[PDB]
Structures are given as C-alpha cells and as structure tokens.
Amino acid sequence: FVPWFSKFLGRIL
Known part of the structure; x- marks a missing residue:
C-alpha cells in the first residue's frame, strides 16, 4: 500500500 x-x-504536524 502507498498511504502518502x-x-x-x-x-505537517
């Protein structure tokens, strides 16, 4: 899977 x-x-956090 690629969860970009x-x-x-x-x-970002």
Whole structure:
C-alpha cells in the first residue's frame, strides 16, 4: 500500500 496521506502528515504536524 502507498498511504502518502500518513507519510506527509508527520511533517505537517
């Protein structure tokens, strides 16, 4: 799976 939505969010937080 590619959850890009959980890969960018760590940096956005």
